[PDB]
């Protein structure tokens, strides 16, 4: 059971990274920030889609 | 392959098999309520989950004097979905009966379906707060279980204490601190509650926190002593 829980955590991690990358391809105006800990992430412009 | 072990209380068995388990002698075999499994040894035996049943958190929490037995009559205030109350019907078996009450109507329909199947449960589908509407149909219960999230547990249980409790009887309340107050500490809220019941004639005996099952729930076991 402990093994299964740890496996689940790993899988959800990979799924979330893949999901953000998949959303990175549609539309909008994207903006790249580096969180000063060293993270790479994005932020969209204040822009309601039609 | 699996062996049994009887418990301190009647009807309660610990199944020592591929994993230890908490189980009760079934009333009727081969019929599920909430998708649980089974085990036989022929005798048919039904599990409880200490997660989804609060009294199951009590038994494997360990309570000395639970006032259930086979041939008696118990009251159950708060039987939503009917799971633990059908299980209590199981442990009182054929001769004893339970009177369950409930107010919200989706578990109302669920419990009344379990009442269609199982006989020993008799359902009352009212707001608990006015016991006249069921003193027309209930008489002289033996023991009482109360799991109602309303904050005036003391008022409602003192009301059913004056109306239906057997003398020198047994009562079990459950307490959710994060529902009654949601800011301060567990034993503090618990001491305040049992102060309320002490002033309302209920002589408590013990209480117990359900740590690795619930988030700061406890249960208070007490008696009704020389009172009407």
């Amino acid at each position: 059971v402990k093994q299964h829980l740890q496996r689940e955590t790993q899988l959800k991690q990979v799924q979330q990274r893949m999901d953000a990358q998949r959303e990175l391809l549609k539309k909008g105006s994207k903006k790249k920030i580096v969180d000063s800990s060293g993270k790479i992430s994005f932020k969209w412009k204040k822009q309601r889609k039609r | 392959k699996v062996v049994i072990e009887p418990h301190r209380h009647a009807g309660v068995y610990i199944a020592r098999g591929k994993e230890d388990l908490l189980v009760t002698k079934n009333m009727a075999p081969g019929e599920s309520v909430y998708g649980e499994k089974r085990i036989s040894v022929k005798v048919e035996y039904r599990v409880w989950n200490p997660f989804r049943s609060k009294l199951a958190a009590g038994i494997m929490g360990g309570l000395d004097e639970l006032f259930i037995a086979p041939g008696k009559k118990v009251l159950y205030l708060g039987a939503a979905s009917g799971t633990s109350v059908s299980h209590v019907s199981d442990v009182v078996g054929p001769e004893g009966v339970v009177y369950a009450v409930e107010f919200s109507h989706r578990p109302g329909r669920e419990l009344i379906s379990m009442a269609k199947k199982r006989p020993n449960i008799i359902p009352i589908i009212e707001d608990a707060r006015h016991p006249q509407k069921y003193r027309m149909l209930i008489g002289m219960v033996d023991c009482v279980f109360a799991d109602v999230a309303q904050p005036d547990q003391a008022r409602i249980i003192a009301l059913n204490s004056h109306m239906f409790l057997k003398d020198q009887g047994g009562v079990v309340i459950s307490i959710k601190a994060n529902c009654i107050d949601s800011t301060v500490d567990a034993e503090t809220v618990f001491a305040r509650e049992v102060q309320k019941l002490r002033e309302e004639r209920i002589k408590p005996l013990e209480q117990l926190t359900l740590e690795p099952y619930e988030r700061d729930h406890c249960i208070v076991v007490g008696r009704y002593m020389r009172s009407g």
Partner: protein, 430 residues
């Protein structure tokens, strides 16, 4: 009529007016209680408690009945004060710096929901909070005193402020009004009282407010105000932490000569003196200090380890015996000298140890008179009783209970005398 009190605990205590007991502890269901107020027609009392919640406890059908009725819709801010408008609206001020308007209405689906939230312009280097709310009936307004030191008149329809004032400097602490709504009195923590007026035709016609006058009369700081305005007299009473009471007039707040009701009123004696070995003895809260004199020196100390009531009625006769009595139990001692020290020994008897004693005096060293809390006179000899001639209960005795109880008694060598506040002086031989 009844008297409810909220302590710093989590209960209300509805007291016992005829006796002076806690008639009922009603525990509220939700945490530490901060403030209380009761509705119009005295029908439903309401408490505001630190979990963020407003509890409605309705009282109907005589005294002692305290049943939970309602919870209001709750939020994360501790409620500091409350005030009812009618059977319909509970106004509450809380330390989110803001004032919420809750609905308590019968037969309308908005029962239970807060339906307005008005806000205060906050301080800077603090975390300000609303201290008191009061409802003004005639011009349908609410007033609030808040901890920046300001007085703000909102109007209750449309929940919006009409007037604002930076009256007195530190945090406001109490407000009150006259009845027909011409003067509103505010009182701070910097010993100042300000009177705000509407009374002229022009300020009525615009319903403006203008602060007429101010005054400082206290020593340390002001804690509570109350107003009264009736055909016999028109006055407010202010109570100040400089532990004393002051009295002012309502029509003439700039004019009326104030009265300073003093620190101690000697209706409760704390000390006693006797010529047997030149003793003065003082009982305080749970402590009995004695002195002998002739200069002086102290003798004893009775930190009564058992119980925690204020020592109500104390006594020592000629010789070294001590009675001290509470409305709960008693405590009786034999005392003894050795010189600069004394010695005390507790006696033992269940009758004295259970019974309740309002007043007590000595006949001899041996037979004393016990005034029970229930108006019963025992005699004990160191369980012999005596009948009492009843007084009539009138309609005022029905309304106000405690007028018929035994107020005072005097006993000399033989004849005792008993007095109840209805106007009865009575003679006993015992």
């Amino acid at each position: 009529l009844r008297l409810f009190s909220i302590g710093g605990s989590t209960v209300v205590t509805e007291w016992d007016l005829a006796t002076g007991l806690p008639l009922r502890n009603y525990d509220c269901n939700s945490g530490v209680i901060w403030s209380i107020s009761i509705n119009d027609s005295q029908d439903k009392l309401s408490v505001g408690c630190d979990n963020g919640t407003v509890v409605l406890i309705d009282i109907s059908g005589g005294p002692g009945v305290l049943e939970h009725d309602t919870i209001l819709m709750r939020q994360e801010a501790r409620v500091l004060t409350l005030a009812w408008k009618k059977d319909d609206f509970v106004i509450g001020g809380c330390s989110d710096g803001r004032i919420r308007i809750w609905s308590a209405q019968k037969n309308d689906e908005n029962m239970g929901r807060l339906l307005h939230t008005m806000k205060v312009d906050k301080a800077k280097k603090e975390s300000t909070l609303v201290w008191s709310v009061i409802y003004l009936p005639r011009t349908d307004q609410i007033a609030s005193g808040d901890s920046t030191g300001s007085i703000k008149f909102w109007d209750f329809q449309f929940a919006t402020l009409n007037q604002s004032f930076k009256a007195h400097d530190a945090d406001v602490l109490c407000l009150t009004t006259d009845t027909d709504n011409n003067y509103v009195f505010s009182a701070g923590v910097d010993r100042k009282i300000f009177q705000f007026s509407q009374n002229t035709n022009k300020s009525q016609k615009n319903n403006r407010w203008v602060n007429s006058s101010n005054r400082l009369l206290h020593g340390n700081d002001i804690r509570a105000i109350c107003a009264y305005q009736s055909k016999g007299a028109d006055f407010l009473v202010s109570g100040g932490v400089e532990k004393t009471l002051v009295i002012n007039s309502l029509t003439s707040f700039s004019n009326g000569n104030y009265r300073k009701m003093p620190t101690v009123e000697p209706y409760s004696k704390n000390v006693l003196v006797n010529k047997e070995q030149r003793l003065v003895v003082s009982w305080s809260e749970s402590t009995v200090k004695i002195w002998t004199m002739g200069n002086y020196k102290l003798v004893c100390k009775l930190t009564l380890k058992d119980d925690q009531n204020i020592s109500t009625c104390s006594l020592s006769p000629d010789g070294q015996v001590l009675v001290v009595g509470r409305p709960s139990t008693t405590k009786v001692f034999h005392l003894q000298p050795v010189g600069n020290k004394l010695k005390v020994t507790k006696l033992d008897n269940d009758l004295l140890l259970r019974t309740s004693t309002k007043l007590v005096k000595f006949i001899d060293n041996s037979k004393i008179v016990i005034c029970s809390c229930e108006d019963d006179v025992f005699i004990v000899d160191l369980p012999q009783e005596v009948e009492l001639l009843e007084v009539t209960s009138t309609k005022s005795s029905i309304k106000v209970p405690y007028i018929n109880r035994i107020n005072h008694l005097e006993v000399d060598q033989n004849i005792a005398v008993i007095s109840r506040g209805c106007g009865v002086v009575d003679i006993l031989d015992l």
